[PDB]
Design an enzyme around this catalytic site. Sequence first.
Site, PDB file in Angstrom:
ATOM      1  N   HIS B 187       0.806  -1.215  -0.060  1.00 38.87           N
ATOM      2  CA  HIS B 187      -0.069   0.127  -0.100  1.00 38.87           C
ATOM      3  C   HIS B 187       0.835   1.356   0.027  1.00 38.87           C
ATOM      4  O   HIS B 187       0.284   2.148  -0.445  1.00 38.87           O
ATOM      5  CB  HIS B 187      -1.009   0.017   1.177  1.00 38.87           C
ATOM      6  CG  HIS B 187      -2.381   0.775   1.076  1.00 38.87           C
ATOM      7  ND1 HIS B 187      -2.339   1.810   0.214  1.00 38.87           N
ATOM      8  CD2 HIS B 187      -3.372   0.605   1.670  1.00 38.87           C
ATOM      9  CE1 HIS B 187      -3.599   2.402   0.187  1.00 38.87           C
ATOM     10  NE2 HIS B 187      -4.285   1.644   1.357  1.00 38.87           N
ATOM     11  N   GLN B 509      -4.409  13.270   3.578  1.00 36.53           N
ATOM     12  CA  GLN B 509      -3.286  12.981   4.519  1.00 36.53           C
ATOM     13  C   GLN B 509      -1.973  13.602   3.917  1.00 36.53           C
ATOM     14  O   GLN B 509      -1.687  13.477   2.531  1.00 36.53           O
ATOM     15  CB  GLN B 509      -3.199  11.462   4.780  1.00 36.53           C
ATOM     16  CG  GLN B 509      -4.480  10.578   5.034  1.00 36.53           C
ATOM     17  CD  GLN B 509      -5.152  10.311   3.822  1.00 36.53           C
ATOM     18  OE1 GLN B 509      -5.106  11.135   2.842  1.00 36.53           O
ATOM     19  NE2 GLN B 509      -5.164   8.917   3.664  1.00 36.53           N
ATOM     20  N   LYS B 512       0.688  12.074   1.315  1.00 36.59           N
ATOM     21  CA  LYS B 512       0.354  12.164  -0.349  1.00 36.59           C
ATOM     22  C   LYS B 512       1.155  13.112  -0.717  1.00 36.59           C
ATOM     23  O   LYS B 512       1.047  13.168  -2.189  1.00 36.59           O
ATOM     24  CB  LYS B 512      -1.042  11.959  -0.428  1.00 36.59           C
ATOM     25  CG  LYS B 512      -1.691  10.847  -0.083  1.00 36.59           C
ATOM     26  CD  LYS B 512      -3.347  10.653  -0.404  1.00 36.59           C
ATOM     27  CE  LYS B 512      -3.987   9.475  -0.112  1.00 36.59           C
ATOM     28  NZ  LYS B 512      -5.316   9.076  -0.790  1.00 36.59           N
ATOM     29  N   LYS B 568     -16.865  13.561   9.711  1.00 36.94           N
ATOM     30  CA  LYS B 568     -17.234  13.554   8.215  1.00 36.94           C
ATOM     31  C   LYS B 568     -18.068  14.563   7.763  1.00 36.94           C
ATOM     32  O   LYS B 568     -18.007  15.000   6.815  1.00 36.94           O
ATOM     33  CB  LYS B 568     -17.844  11.763   8.108  1.00 36.94           C
ATOM     34  CG  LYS B 568     -18.125  11.653   6.655  1.00 36.94           C
ATOM     35  CD  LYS B 568     -16.969  11.227   5.960  1.00 36.94           C
ATOM     36  CE  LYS B 568     -17.369  10.875   4.460  1.00 36.94           C
ATOM     37  NZ  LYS B 568     -16.340  10.158   3.832  1.00 36.94           N
ATOM     38  N   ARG B 574     -17.677  21.620   4.926  1.00 36.86           N
ATOM     39  CA  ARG B 574     -16.734  22.934   4.859  1.00 36.86           C
ATOM     40  C   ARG B 574     -15.980  22.895   3.372  1.00 36.86           C
ATOM     41  O   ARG B 574     -15.525  24.019   3.301  1.00 36.86           O
ATOM     42  CB  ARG B 574     -15.919  22.893   5.777  1.00 36.86           C
ATOM     43  CG  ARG B 574     -14.838  21.793   5.848  1.00 36.86           C
ATOM     44  CD  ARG B 574     -13.928  21.739   7.097  1.00 36.86           C
ATOM     45  NE  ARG B 574     -12.865  20.750   7.296  1.00 36.86           N
ATOM     46  CZ  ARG B 574     -12.090  20.653   8.337  1.00 36.86           C
ATOM     47  NH1 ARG B 574     -12.204  21.272   9.358  1.00 36.86           N
ATOM     48  NH2 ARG B 574     -11.048  19.733   8.177  1.00 36.86           N
ATOM     49  N   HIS B 590      -9.189  10.068  -3.174  1.00 37.22           N
ATOM     50  CA  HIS B 590      -9.998   9.013  -3.555  1.00 37.22           C
ATOM     51  C   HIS B 590     -11.328   9.554  -2.893  1.00 37.22           C
ATOM     52  O   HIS B 590     -12.197   9.902  -3.722  1.00 37.22           O
ATOM     53  CB  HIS B 590      -9.470   7.917  -3.471  1.00 37.22           C
ATOM     54  CG  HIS B 590      -8.301   7.227  -3.889  1.00 37.22           C
ATOM     55  ND1 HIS B 590      -7.427   6.470  -3.699  1.00 37.22           N
ATOM     56  CD2 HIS B 590      -7.259   8.081  -4.910  1.00 37.22           C
ATOM     57  CE1 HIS B 590      -6.455   6.295  -4.268  1.00 37.22           C
ATOM     58  NE2 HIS B 590      -6.343   7.051  -5.054  1.00 37.22           N
ATOM     59  N   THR B 592     -11.859  11.711  -0.989  1.00 38.51           N
ATOM     60  CA  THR B 592     -11.657  13.097  -0.732  1.00 38.51           C
ATOM     61  C   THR B 592     -11.935  13.636  -2.155  1.00 38.51           C
ATOM     62  O   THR B 592     -12.578  15.047  -2.033  1.00 38.51           O
ATOM     63  CB  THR B 592     -10.409  13.585  -0.166  1.00 38.51           C
ATOM     64  OG1 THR B 592      -9.216  13.146  -0.853  1.00 38.51           O
ATOM     65  CG2 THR B 592     -10.454  12.989   1.502  1.00 38.51           C
ATOM     66  N   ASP B 595     -15.594  14.028  -2.066  1.00 32.36           N
ATOM     67  CA  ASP B 595     -16.262  14.940  -1.116  1.00 32.36           C
ATOM     68  C   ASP B 595     -16.345  16.253  -1.548  1.00 32.36           C
ATOM     69  O   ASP B 595     -17.378  16.999  -1.377  1.00 32.36           O
ATOM     70  CB  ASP B 595     -15.271  14.749   0.124  1.00 32.36           C
ATOM     71  CG  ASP B 595     -15.507  13.231   1.040  1.00 32.36           C
ATOM     72  OD1 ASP B 595     -16.431  12.795   0.720  1.00 32.36           O
ATOM     73  OD2 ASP B 595     -14.678  13.112   1.607  1.00 32.36           O
TER      74      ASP B 595
END
EC number: 2.4.1.255
Lengths: 14, 698
Positions: B187, B509, B512, B568, B574, B590, B592, B595
């Site tokens: 990962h 995060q 990344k 969440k 926001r 992904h 996000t 979102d």
Amino acid sequence: THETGTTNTATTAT
Amino acid sequence: SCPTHADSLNNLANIKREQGNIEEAVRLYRKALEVFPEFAAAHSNLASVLQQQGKLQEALMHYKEAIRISPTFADAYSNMGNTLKEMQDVQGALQCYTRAIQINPAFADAHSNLASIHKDSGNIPEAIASYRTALKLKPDFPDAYCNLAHCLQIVCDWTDYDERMKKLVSIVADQLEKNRLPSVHPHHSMLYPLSHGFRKAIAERHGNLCLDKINVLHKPPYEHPKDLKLSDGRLRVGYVSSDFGNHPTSHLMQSIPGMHNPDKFEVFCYALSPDDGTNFRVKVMAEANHFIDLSQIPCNGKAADRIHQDGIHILVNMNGYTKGARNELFALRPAPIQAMWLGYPGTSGALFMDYIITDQETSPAEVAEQYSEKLAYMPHTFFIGDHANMFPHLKKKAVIDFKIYDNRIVLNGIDLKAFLDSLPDVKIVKMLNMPVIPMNTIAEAVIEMINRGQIQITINGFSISNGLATTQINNKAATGEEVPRTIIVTTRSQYGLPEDAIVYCNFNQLYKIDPSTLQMWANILKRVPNSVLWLLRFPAVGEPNIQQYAQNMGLPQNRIIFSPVAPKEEHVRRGQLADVCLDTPLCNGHTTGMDVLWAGTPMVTMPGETLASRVAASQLTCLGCLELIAKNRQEYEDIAVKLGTDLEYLKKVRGKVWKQRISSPLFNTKQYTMELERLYLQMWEHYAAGNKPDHMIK
Ligand SMILES: O=C(O)CCCCOc1ccccc1[C@@H](NS(=O)(=O)c1ccc2[nH]c(=O)ccc2c1)C(=O)N(CC(=O)O)Cc1cccs1
């Protein structure tokens, strides 16, 4: 998150 | 008898273990114990290979025997800690590591294993110090080096980053050449400049760990169904996940099991985690045709037996190499067709997975060599989210005209329209259109609530809630388990964002982000004078590192604004305050990505070569915003700068996102499930005709 791998110790016989 | 006998069996077994001959190692260890029953080293070494075979209680027994024989046997304590950690007994692991280090302060492996506890606990500074002690004691230590490197990635410490990447790649190359398990986790491999062959090889070798744990079960191959007669013509699909609960994967697909067509499909959900009591788990248990709690069946042999007895035709691996996975279940092949789907952004590299469910944008046929699986294409994007079901209160919005902006002071709510019916002085703006509350008495009271930090107020019988206080009003609404009841107020002032400047955001995060990405973002901010970058403290200790590097690139500190991680619902809500989202090219957002688009915020992305680096462009293609997808860094920068400087264009593009989040298939879970079902049937017909898996790219 996944758990961090660890390191096994191999003991040499003497 | 001569001591060389038992010593020679033990030392030869150590070699066999290194080579991967685990079964042979076990035999030699046990013969050594026959010759020399009180052989502490053989007890501890045997326990190490039993741990590797998943026989954890038997390993513990032999560690304790070794320590009874030799109370100051530090190897045995450290090895036992590793087994307790795997059993989720973190306190026991710590007690074992601290004992091993007390016996032998120079014990490099024990320091590195201790560091892994701090890393997993969120104590990155202490993890870093312990990994560095380990490398000081044992300078050639790939596990410590690579896990240290990930600690530094986590906090965006880029000291000597170029040389760090060199050595990471060198370590992997050496371990792959020497037929050893790479110290880079599958990962994480996406974050480093490894070849695609190395990334697939890393994955394959981690999957082979599952084989060691199932081979000890000595189970024969399963007989698989070759028709739908026993299932009354229905195809039996089994979804295997540890994340049926309050986890991002449920936030993506919790609607899908209940949307399957019961006339043609029978849905089995196999939970690898216990019931966490959230509505996410309630919903899947209630809507799946069958729900099986495999967390009550810890033996992978008995659990695979259960899957097989249910007659599953297609078994769907939703974990890959993530926390909570039991890929041993797939290694045993209880189903004739086994597919990767959604939860893991990469290949398993393993022989026991037939397909990865993806799409032509994410995984163009010209890069099929990156995957061990055959490609199975969804027609638009393989990604999906439950945002329409979870966050319908964000389908509409109104603003307060504190002077007109769409993202400085924002109201959302189910009863928001009903509320505005009562306010005769509201103005309707058409760029659906947007109501604008003038600076009247009601508006002043709302702004007073925000400035004063009150939790909520009541106007005309309507509850108006402070967007920062959702957990105090309804914890189930904050988590996304329930739709908020009240009208919620969200403002740039809540987060220290400027009222008269462009806000670029990224809520991923921090691991990344790499130097190249921050340099690219710096180039953008330098070209849009009225602009800041809005980032998340994940973790907070990364904040001063990003600030230091940004200033080295010519960005003053006041150009980057950090917010804490939010629940969440607030996190999604926001996003409406940003003008533009800047996607991370190394590994995209992904969840996000979904979102920000649900909030109506355009996302700029530059798709790379890995699956994880191409998801956001796949989402934007499905959404229908091809102009937000860059072919290179220049285009990425130019797109973001145009959005921040041509305000008419920005209004146009934001309007496209706001409208097409509804009209495009991106958030349409009903259409997704239907297309997913067509894909399953193409797989089944292919197998029923006696064919081995092949690409389903039409
Ligand atoms: O698909 C992708 O894009 C990457 C997914 C990686 C896996 O994440 C996991 C794993 C196991 C358990 C829970 C999670 C997260 N849930 S979530 O639905 O994705 C979320 C919920 C609230 C949030 N509030 C914010 O302010 C910003 C982001 C955010 C995200 C989580 O709660 N996180 C925060 C934390 O643990 O403190 C992790 C983050 C992901 C991205 C930024 S932080």
